């Protein structure tokens, strides 16, 4: 390296092979590969030393032929510079100031840069995604009129890769990472776009989230849900609900679709429309709004095939709509006792961290309360599941004053306040528990 620093010599391809092919490509110890990777990283630093004709030769000859499964962090910065230097020399990219911004689309290295992220460990995939977002999102002149063409082409390609990866499950844990990473490609991709139109993009994604609970893969649901949330509401779905609401103004199956996850997204859509759109509240309450929200909360077959976060995610969203429904109708009767028994049962398990037991005989929920190994801590999201649940209970009791009168007699509605004020934890829930008990008083 030091000899080839100021001697003005060009590292010819023949000797470039033997230092490459026979040294690290066929090695024994991992440090042997580490040595060659970093040595290349400094060698091509900011100025070529093999001359561009060899640079376009040996990088595309066997450097790209390296197995992505055996590649480390040092393999990234050399690989990135190869993408930057080789592409900008032929006229496929431009260095510009720092970021080698896009000029062509059929890049010589994009063929296996997808392979690098699809088949690697956690750190390598992140860097590969970092490079994909760096090149794809950053677009400049001479294609600046073609955002739709480039962005849609990128989106459809991943969806095809997602769909191709999807059908394999129907190595299962390995392919599960493939969906996680290909979605991981998608999520930061749209991040720089801000700084979709196809209904199929969510319809397929609906089944994707359900498959996450089919094998109980946590990040799959997380990946799909974050992707949907960081995605402006689907045009087809938003018009469909208001059309049926308008149709019923002059729907039960809409929110009770057999697919589990799509219920969560549809509930998310309505609440987003309701909160700041002024007319949708009137249409929703008129057709079936308040009767449905209580029915979907008081029923056991609301989502029989529900994962832990899916059902509570269905809950935490549903109760949010129940707020503005009751407040609007407050200025001026379906609510009854059976509705409350569910809502109290929601908070029962919610402050226990055991919403899965929200269909328990209610004696078990007491049992975990009395210092059961200190393992009933509510999650940072179970805290809300209690919070908007309590305030809804206050609004309903304002509508029906006599309902709370009968509740004092039973054993329930006595241990309920004791648990929510003494045996509960994570004070913020207990803060609203007492405070909302005061308003009803």
Curated annotation (Swiss-Prot):
Expression by tissue: Widely expressed in embryonic and adult tissues.
Compartments, as annotated in UniProt: Cytoplasm, Cytosol; Cell projection, Growth cone; Cytoplasm, Cytoskeleton, Cilium axoneme
Induction / repression: By growth factors.
Top-level taxon of origin: Eukaryota
Biological role stated in the UniProt entry: Deubiquitinase involved both in the processing of ubiquitin precursors and of ubiquitinated proteins. May therefore play an important regulatory role at the level of protein turnover by preventing degradation of proteins through the removal of conjugated ubiquitin. Specifically hydrolyzes 'Lys-11'-, followed by 'Lys-63'-, 'Lys-48'- and 'Lys-6'-linked polyubiquitins chains. Essential component of TGF-beta/BMP signaling cascade. Specifically deubiquitinates monoubiquitinated SMAD4, opposing the activity of E3 ubiquitin-protein ligase TRIM33. Deubiquitinates alkylation repair enzyme ALKBH3.
Similarity comment: family membership: Belongs to the peptidase C19 family.
Illness association: Intellectual developmental disorder, X-linked 99: A disorder characterized by significantly below average general intellectual functioning associated with impairments in adaptive behavior and manifested during the developmental period. Intellectual deficiency is the only primary symptom of non-syndromic X-linked forms, while syndromic forms present with associated physical, neurological and/or psychiatric manifestations. Intellectual developmental disorder, X-linked 99, syndromic, female-restricted: A form of intellectual disability, a disorder characterized by significantly below average general intellectual functioning, associated with impairments in adaptive behavior and manifested during the developmental period.
Subunit: Interacts with SMAD4, MARK4, NUAK1 and BIRC5/survivin. Interacts with DCX. Interacts with OTUD4 and USP7; the interaction is direct.
Note: Escapes X-inactivation.
Protein name: Ubiquitin carboxyl-terminal hydrolase 9X
Gene behind this protein: USP9X
